[PDB]
Amino acid sequence: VDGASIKFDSICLYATFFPMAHNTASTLEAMLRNDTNDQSFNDYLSAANM
Amino acid sequence: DATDPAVRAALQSQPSGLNSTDDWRQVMDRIMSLTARNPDAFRQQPQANRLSAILEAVVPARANPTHEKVLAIVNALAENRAIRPDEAGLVYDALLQRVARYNSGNVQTNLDRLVGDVREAVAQRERAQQQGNLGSMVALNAFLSTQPANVPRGQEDYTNFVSALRLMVTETPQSEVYQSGPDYFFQTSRQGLQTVNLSQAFKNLQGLWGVRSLLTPNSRLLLLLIAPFTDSGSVSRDTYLGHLLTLYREAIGQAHVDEHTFQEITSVSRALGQEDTGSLEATLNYLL
Fold this sequence. Notes:
The structure is cut from a larger assembly and holds chains A and B.
Chain A: H1 24-32
Chain B: H1 7-13, H2 24-31, H3 47-58, H4 66-77, H5 90-101, H6 105-131, H7 134-146, H8 155-170, E1 176-180, E2 183-187, E3 195-197, H9 198-201, H10 217-225, H11 240-265, H12 267-270, H13 282-287
Antiparallel strand pairs in B: 1-2, 2-3
Helix pairs in contact in B: 1-4, 2-3, 4-5, 4-6, 7-8
């Protein structure tokens, strides 16, 4: 009601890459595709919220 | 023939075609059609080209060899470094002016003797370059006159070392010895590094031939250069100079097989896929 407005011109996605060596980043790739090396995470709040 | 001062003078004064004076037989084989390849190539010329070659054949034209005899001399002076290549036109007009003031039957014969003399002197210098011995043997034997021929201890090691010292300057045509003030030196190549000091090395090795932290690093540079020209029986086994000459022969042989090992490891580290910065540093730290 108070006349505030937001308008999106453009959105760009950025992604910073560690310049890892191509034998090191291929060893790390091959280790992290094994199902025992799955990256498991956790919500910090960890709650169902009612 | 590319370094022949009269072949080079023929490529700068004589025509590149078949005139009937320098090449009389080769043009009479073509006028008279007795050539193997294309005999009938002379009948297919106009009368201006065909009759003007017959007239130069049945009565040929005389010529001056004087500009060709002098240019063979100038192109040998410029080749044996007697003149500069910029002075090649200056001394050519200077010699043509002298053989024009003093022209005779004696001088034109004497220029004919001297263009055979400079063919030899160009080839004699180029043989002496590839042999590479005459400037070094007269200055290494001049060095060894200064050094005494009788050390107190270890004369057997000393007279085989100085005989192997004559073997470097003989079996390496680029190596040379000279003098610069008091001392004499030894370069392993023309305009190259590893210059040892002979007068400082033999005043260091004198007193170490029978000893069985104390060596100047140019003496050790001399013991590195003399190592492939020294047998196991040329010096002793227990003597500290003889113990190092075997140790420097193993160091050359290990650096000769670490050279071939380097060319193998870096070849299979590019195809396997590594950092090209770290493939070249981890290999040397494995080899050094």
